[PDB]
Amino acid sequence: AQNPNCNIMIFHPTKEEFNDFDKYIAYMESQGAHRAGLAKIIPPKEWKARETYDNISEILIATPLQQVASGRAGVFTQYHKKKKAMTVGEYRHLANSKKYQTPPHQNFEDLERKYWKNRIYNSPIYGADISGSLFDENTKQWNLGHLGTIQDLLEKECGVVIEGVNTPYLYFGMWKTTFAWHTEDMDLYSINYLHLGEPKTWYVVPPEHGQRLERLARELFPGSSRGCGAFLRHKVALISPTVLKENGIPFNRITQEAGEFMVTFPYGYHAGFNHGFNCAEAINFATPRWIDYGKMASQCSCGEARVTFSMDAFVRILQPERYDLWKRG
C-alpha cells in the first residue's frame, strides 16, 4: 500500500510530465497521493500561468463577504455578511490597510498560532466563487479553464449525455479570510492555483477518516447537526488543529505559496486560511475513480447549502433515490 500514513505528498513534474493532466493525476494516485486528501504540485520552471498580473485591478468583486465569527477560538462558526461591490484594486488596498494587514511574524508557524488565537475577534473580507480565469489562453499545460469537464467524464464513463458546464472560479483573500471544513460538491476533486500574493495554509483529513471528522463536528456543533444531517455542506464550521489533535482526529497541514497548485481528492475534508492579500483560481474536476464517491456523497436537503454550481444532473443520474428529496430542499 502506497503512502500508508496518508502524508501530504509534493510533486515536481517535468515539462514533459506536465502535458497530460489526467495522466499525472493518475500518476500521483499510483504513488498514494490521494490517501492524504490533498497534494501539492510545483510546476516546472519552464511554465508560467500568464505573463503578468499588472492588469487585474479592474476585476469586480460584485459581493465581497465579511466573515463574522461566533463561538470559541478553536471551535466556531462564521457567517457571510454581504458588502457593497468593490474592484480588485480597491480590495487590495483594503487588505493592506492597518485594520486588515498581516501582522509582523517570524515564520508560518508563528502566523498560524496568531490566526487560531485571534481569528474570531476580527471579520476579514473575502471575495469568492467569482466566475472567471486569469490563465493566459496561450498556456496549454494545467490551464484550469481547459480541463476536461465533469459532464464529459460522466458521459465517457456511464454513457449518458447531461446538461451543464464546468468553469473556473476566482478567489480574493486577505489575512484571516477563512474556508470552513468541507468536501467538494458531490465529493468531486478540486484543483487550486495560487496566482498572486501571500500564502494559504491548508488542513486536510484523509478520505479514509472523513467520518471521524463528521462525528466530532456533530459533537461540537450539536444544534447545527440536529438541523441537518450533512451540515458540513453548509461550509460554516471551523475546528482548530489543537482541537483535532485533542480528539485524535487524523489530519495534516501544509502552506501553499504563489505559483503552486493544490489538488484535493474525493471526500478529502479541508479547511484553511489566507496569510494576506492573494488571488487564487479553482475548479472541480472528475476522474473515473470519482464516480463511486459521487454515488455515495452526502447531501444537504435542508435548504442551506445551495452550491458552488449545479449538481442537479449528477444527483439525478448517480443518486436517483435521493433526487426528489434533495430537489425539494
Ligand X SMILES: [NH3+]NC(=O)[C@H](NC(=O)c1ccc(Br)cc1)c1nn[nH]n1
Annotated binding site for Zn(2+): 228, 234, 300, 302
One character per residue 56-95, x = contact with Cl ion (rule: CB under 5 A) = ----------------------------------------
Identity of the residue, 86 or 204, whose beta carbon is nearer to Ni ion in the bound complex:
204
Q: Residue 127: CB partners within 8 Å, gap ≥ 6?
A: 61, 64, 65, 88, 91, 170, 171, 172, 173
Length of the chain: 329
CA–CA distance from 303 to each of 8, 21, 98, 177, 228 (Å)?
Answer: 34, 35, 38, 25, 9
Q: Render the burial of 12-42: b for 16+ CB within 10 Å, e for the rest.
A: ebeeeebeebeebbeebbeebbbbbbbbbbe
Note whether 228 binds Zn ion by CB under 5 A: yes
Note whether 17 binds Zn ion by CB under 5 A: no
Taking the C-alpha atoms of residue 297 and residue 197, their distance in angstroms, rounded to an integer, is 34
Identity of the residue, 50 or 114, whose beta carbon is nearer to Cl ion in the bound complex:
114
Taking the C-alpha atoms of residue 213 and residue 167, their distance in angstroms, rounded to an integer, is 30
Window contacting Zn ion (CB under 5 A); options: 116-124, 204-212, 242-250, 303-311: 303-311
Note whether 92 binds ligand X by CB under 6 A: no
**128 contacts which partner out of Ni ion, Cl ion, ligand X, none, CB within 5 to 8 A by kind?**
ligand X
Note whether 211 binds Cl ion by CB under 5 A: no
All cell numbers assigned to 194: 495560487
| CA neighbor of 191 nearest in space, from 278, 285, 274 | 285
Residue list 266-285, contact with ligand X (CB under 6 A): 280, 282
For residue 303, give the DSSP letter. S
**312 contacts which partner out of Zn ion, Cl ion, Ni ion, none, CB within 5 to 8 A by kind?**
none
Note whether 326 binds Zn ion by CB under 5 A: no
Single-letter residue type at 148: G
Residue in the shown chain whose Cβ atom is closest to Ni ion: 190
Distance of closest approach, residue 264 Cβ to ligand X, in angstroms: 7
One character per residue 254-293, x = contact with Zn ion (rule: CB under 5 A) = ----------------------------------------
Note whether 192 binds ligand X by CB under 6 A: yes
Handedness of CA 288, 138, 309, 216 (dihedral sign): positive
Separation of CA 75 from chain center:
20
Continuous segment of H or E residues that includes residue 149:
none
Binding residue ranges for 2-oxoglutarate: 126, 192, 200, 235
All cell numbers assigned to 249: 482526529
* 195: helix, strand or coil: strand
**118 contacts which partner out of Ni ion, Cl ion, Zn ion, none, CB within 5 to 8 A by kind?**
Cl ion
Identity of the residue, 60 or 302, whose beta carbon is nearer to Zn ion in the bound complex:
302
What residues line the site for Cl ion (CB under 5 A)?
103, 114, 118
What residues line the site for Ni ion (CB under 5 A)?
190
What residues line the site for ligand X (CB under 6 A)?
80, 128-129, 171, 179, 182, 184, 190, 192, 235, 280, 282
